[PDB]
Amino acid sequence: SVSKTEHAEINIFSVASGHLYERMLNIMMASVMHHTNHTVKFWFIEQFLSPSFKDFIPHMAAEYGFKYEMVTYKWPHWLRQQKEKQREIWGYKILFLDVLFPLSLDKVIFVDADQIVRTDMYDLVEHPLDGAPYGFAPMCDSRVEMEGYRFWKTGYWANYLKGKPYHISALYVVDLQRFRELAAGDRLRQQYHALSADPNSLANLDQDLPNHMQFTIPIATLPQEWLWCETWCSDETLKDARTIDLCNNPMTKEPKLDRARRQVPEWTKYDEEIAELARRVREGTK
Ligand SMILES: O=c1ccn([C@@H]2O[C@H](COP(=O)(O)OP(=O)(O)O[C@H]3O[C@H](CO)[C@@H](O)[C@H](O)[C@H]3O)[C@@H](O)[C@H]2O)c(=O)[nH]1
Ligand SMILES: *[C@@H]1O[C@H](CO)[C@@H](O[C@@H]2O[C@H](CO)[C@@H](O)[C@H](O)[C@H]2NC(C)=O)[C@H](O)[C@H]1NC(C)=O
Numbered sequence: 001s002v003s004k005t006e007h008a009e010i011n012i013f014s015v016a017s018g019h020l021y022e023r024m025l026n027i028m029m030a031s032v033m034h035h036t037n038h039t040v041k042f043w044f045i046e047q048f049l050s051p052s053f054k055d056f057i058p059h060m061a062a063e064y065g066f067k068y069e070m071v072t073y074k075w076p077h078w079l080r081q082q083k084e085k086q087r088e089i090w091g092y093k094i095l096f097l098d099v100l101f102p103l104s105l106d107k108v109i110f111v112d113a114d115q116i117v118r119t120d121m122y123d124l125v126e127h128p129l130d131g132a133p134y135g136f137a138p139m140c141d142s143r144v145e146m147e148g149y150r151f152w153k154t155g156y157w158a159n160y161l162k163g164k165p166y167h168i169s170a171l172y173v174v175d176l177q178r179f180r181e182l183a184a185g186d187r188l189r190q191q192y193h194a195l196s197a198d199p200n201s202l203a204n205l206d207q208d209l210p211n212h213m214q215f216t217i218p219i220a221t222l223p224q225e226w227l228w229c230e231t232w233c234s235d236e237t238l239k240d241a242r243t244i245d246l247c248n249n250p251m252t253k254e255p256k257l258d259r260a261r262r263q264v265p266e267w268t269k270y271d272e273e274i275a276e277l278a279r280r281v282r283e284g285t286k
């Protein structure tokens with residue numbers, strides 16, 4: 001209850017780098033705000049954001065009625081670094097959950113910058129984790145034509161998981177109090193440091209690490225409805241989706257903005273609403 005007052009009832013963090021992902025990140029935030037009356041605070045990994053995004057965020061905050069905080073955490077020199085920017089961004093999603101946020105924040109949800117929310121995110125805040133420090137949705141099996149690309153259903157992963165789900169990292173709820181109690185952050189950092197000695201390991205860093213650790217750092221498998229991606233999930237389950245991820249389709253290679261406009265009817269309305277807000281701020285400041 002002290003976390004709800006000092007911060008907000010719903011706390012979401014995301015990571016974005018590049019104009020395309022920042023444009024989608026504003027849309028993700030507008031989609032959250034249109035679907036809840038609970039208080040919201042957005043948390044941003046500052047060093048990857050553009051100066052324009054950081055200058056526009058107080059205008060988004062005042063227009064949509066949310067609070068926000070910029071977090072700048074320095075990668076520890078002992079911890080194996082990532083030379084690829086994409087892999088460093090993935091490290092920021094999963095390696096520092098216990099230290100990016102203040103001790104007074106009890107719970108935080110990661111929501112991908114390219115996501116569209118169609119639900120009250122307070123329902124995820126209230127989802128029962130039963131002592132798991134975090135919850136992720138599983139990868140869908142419902143789009144049968146994509147079975148050849150489900151790498152987690154054959155080879156190394158099928159033998160390692162033994163039927164346990166392979167989870168997607170586009171969305172996850174973190175009970176920070178339980179995550180801290182279980183020292184999950186220190187354990188993920190130490191395991192990542194040891195596993196990353198092999199440069200071929202953790203190809204999908206943010207996703208492979210929690211899935212590899214799920215027999216010792218439990219994952220509360222979220223209802224499949226919490227994350228729908230066309231690449232893996234059936235058309236028929238879209239009407240039940242609480243959130244949508246615009247995940248890459250290895251078969252079609254369709255561009256990101258084309259996937260957004262084709263799959264999500266309300267995407268253009270959020271995009272035009274934020275562009276109208278940008279034009280209004282441009283005249284008021286210039
Ligand atoms: O120039 C770029 C490219 C990517 N990203 C971020 O990198 C991640 C992955 O990019 P994305 O376009 O979302 O790829 P997807 O196919 O959507 O990725 C899926 O699979 C990844 C793991 O393989 C997870 O990190 C994603 O959350 C999940 O949506 C996301 O957090 C993006 O915000 C950037 O910020 N800038
Ligand atoms: C947030 O509050 C608004 C009211 O300010 C809610 O809007 C109503 O939603 C119902 C949905 O059954 C509509 O039938 C009404 O016409 C809406 N009324 C108004 C005045 O907008 C909205 O549903 C609330 N959202 C959530 C998720 O609680």
Ligand SMILES: [Ca+2]
Binds near residue numbers: 113114170245246247
């Ligand atoms: Ca994504």
